[PDB]
């Protein structure tokens, strides 16, 4: 700020430690003036920012700061002298006064005011309080704001400290003083602080109320202001202001390759056959299987002090379900490394009167969480319309680190022809049809060509939207047959959707052809999956799999 | 698209140029094959990624493309000679075919296929059809995209081409297929283009319907899809897809420092003397004064086709809340700074400044948020909030304004500073002639013997100092570029500030010629003292001032700096 002084009478000024208070000596100068000498207190930082006896430049900023907060009203005073050849120097007095006002927060991102990203960047992280709540848990889920002012005892008789936020971001932040006392929030964008003289520390804890959205660009700001108030008839004037940086935590979705922590079940009560295999699997996996004690997708928000998990659930189309919403492993797309995955979702290739796609609200919601940029897919030609019915990710403890199982009906034809060319071509599937009875259906060949053509489009679109390669995709046999409105469906029960319970998993049984008392599809999928290092269990086939939240924190990427 | 070859029979396909033709080699491989070979001419651009014994690698990439276009089916032949150790070499066949597909437009931000800002960006700007506006006339002002298809004639009997926009973007693009023409717009998301085979060129004219706003970042995309319908019962299969991207041109405001092209007037009063002075002043400025025969800001949406002037209001181009609004969000509040440099970020197109309070409060006033989010969507001009609620008018131009100056950085900011008025009054009374009458008439010694005025007046100087530091940090200004205009302020009910005598800074500027309202000040030596100072400080630089007893909107030239060359 600027203060201007009149030589005929003393006046009162205030400088805050840390800011360079500008002083102009020329505009309000005495009538005749050409040379200046500074004889000031040793404790005052009086610098010059733009002894060579430089003349009175129009704009010559003299920066002023003082360190030691006083005890009385304006102990320190400053005087200037101006020596010329016309008369002895004239005098000006300034009643200066030091104070210290500091607002420190989670500056190190370890646990400061306007939202900001950055792996090496300044800004605290806010956990979204989508629930309405003490003690340690409050100390550990809200960010830390600490207020420290060193002042003269009677200094705040004529001064005031005010704490405020911008009016566009007022709705989605809230701060408590330390039941909890509301300082700011959706209703109060500003407040005045009651700080007595000397030292008084009042601490604040910060929370949000919403996730990044379309109408929420990505700032929440804080600014501290100092008011000069010496006269009771004039409006309040400002002397000091600081404005700095903190950011909100988004929502996240969890893939099927993380080491699980807790898995669940449903209520169909076929568990005695269903949950027997999965229960023995969890005993093999040493995972804690609390079945459902008695559609729902599991994510987590994180801060430097907490990683509280959350769950979400849901003019309705068949492509809007979360089964059409599948998250890739930690990925790297064209240099942009998404350690939190790229959400993958299916819609049509061109819209028409009959095309289907997601609600734009949901796509924008996943877009606004710029940690996971979504990807458009093509799963409209399929009758149900989900991506999980033809794509899946399974853990890979070697090579690249994750395996994409993709349905491919053309390897099924290869195997069926191969085992028919071995003499025993009368294997019974499931009515029951021979291998010849299926290889002698020309309609199936054309249906298969059409379905594989639709598959390849999605395939290419994953290889470009996930940074994939030919070595990272493995094909599983699955024949397809069309239906009403010429929509595709699987021939035998789907084998690409399955329960990943670790490095060993559960796949539904094919109930297919029997080869010397064994199912050929089963031995093939085991010869294609197990050598990588997995173990597969086969069962007649509702399950939600909570996993360990990522070691990577969302604030360490550059979106 | 992926192409798969089965050893039982060869497969025919159409390979559109622009996609590296990928070949699948593992899913449908022969039962005894472990290696295979290729046969083609040296001129063929064959792309292989690991004769020569190429085995069945899990990640061997095979992409093929051609150096010509085919209007005749299978003008080139490519046999893939799989070779087996104990099996005679089986040969997968593929009669190559390429159609010439061209989606040509103004795609260097000059209206991956993406949009990037900067002087060397990619994209196409479209201008808003804010008018209520045959085929020969609109070809110059509109954006025309050229779709060139060179395909065999028999294609479009079992193939269809489809143009479309997303199911969120229809109401923001209208395309005309070169009166009434609905291709894809407010009601139609897609169009089945009836394209005769052979070689054919197609033109579309594109106009918007909305400016960048809160919900619209500004980018739109248009995609053409090439399908396949060989069978009449099964669904269509996509063969190729191409895309282009546009951005809506955003409205740009106009500062008070740009050369004039058309000055406008309003016959609110008779003001014959004012009118004669204005026409004399405009003839001195050599501008075409268009009197209206019986606020509104005249900007421009600059595009690489035309720079249509834009009328923004609360002819040219004309671009709401039910009620209960406050008067201080009017358009006199929004003033455009010249190009500046703020904390490193440099703004060639200006920094919009407006009226608000320094800290939000219950009695504080601020602009309607709609304009703030609007001009924020205009990422070209990042706004700045200032401390100008301490007046009862709340307009930033009531105490500061930018005048042209051929010296240094080309602009000078007049700030209404109380304290120079008192300084000059002190000097004039010190020299002796301190009893001249002002204007209700009051004396020079009387005001200098008024201390209440010195306190209201010093408080206003404190507010001016705060806003001065704000401009030094939010406009990157300096202390030497601020002329302290002598001007006194007073307070009224609710402690709001007002001008005492007519404000010399709320002046209608029409170039270098300052139409300053008359101060009606003390008379000494023949002239007015405030007039004396303003003539003794501006004239040594070269300005010319005329003092009228004061509704003049001035359309001005564009900055000639293309908006698509800067990074928000």
Residue numbers in the entry:
A (entry chain B): 5 to 54, 65 to 125, 136 to 157, 172 to 216, 224 to 339, 351 to 370, 400 to 515, 522 to 632, ...
B (entry chain A): 5 to 54, 65 to 125, 136 to 157, 172 to 216, 224 to 339, 351 to 370, 388 to 392, 396 to 515, ...
From the paper:
Citrullination, the loss of a positive charge on the arginine side chain to form citrulline, is catalyzed by peptidylarginine deiminase 4 (PAD4) of the PAD enzyme family. PAD4 is implicated in rheumatoid arthritis (RA), where citrullinated epitopes serve as important diagnostic and pathological factors. The active form of PAD4 is a homodimer, and dimerization greatly affects enzyme activity because monomeric mutants are less active. In this study, we identified GAGs as physiological allosteric coactivators of PAD4.
PAD4 activation was observed at 0.1 mM CaCl2 in our assays; therefore, we aimed to determine the PAD4–GAG complex structure under these conditions using Dp20. The obtained map showed two dimers of PAD4 connected by two Dp20 chains bound proximal to the region spanning a flexible, unresolved loop, including R123 to R137, and rich in positively charged residues (123-RTGKVKPTRAVKDQR-137). The two dimers were stacked face-to-back and angled close to 90° in the x–y plane, forming a cross-like double-propeller structure. In the x–z plane, the top dimer lies nearly flat on the bottom dimer. This organization allows interaction between the NLS region of the lower dimer (K59, K60, and K61) and the region near the Ca3-5 calcium-binding sites of the top dimer. We also determined the structure of PAD4 in the presence of Dp20 and in the absence of calcium. In this case, different structures were formed, consisting of a single PAD4 dimer with GAG oligomers spanning across the dimer to bridge two regions proximal to the N-terminal of the protein (“handbag” like structure). Importantly, these interaction anchors between the GAG and PAD4 were located near the contact surface between the monomers, encompassing the positively charged NLS. Additionally, as inferred from the density map, a GAG chain in the correct conformation can make contact with a loop containing R123. The observed change in the dimer–dimer organization between Dp12 and Dp20 at 0.1 mM Ca2+ consists of the introduction of an additional GAG anchor point for a longer Dp20 oligomer, which introduces torsion sufficient to pull the dimers together and form the 90° double-propeller, cross-like structure. This, in turn, allows for the interaction between the NLS, located in the N-terminal domain of the lower dimer, and the calcium sites Ca3-5 located on the side of the top dimer.
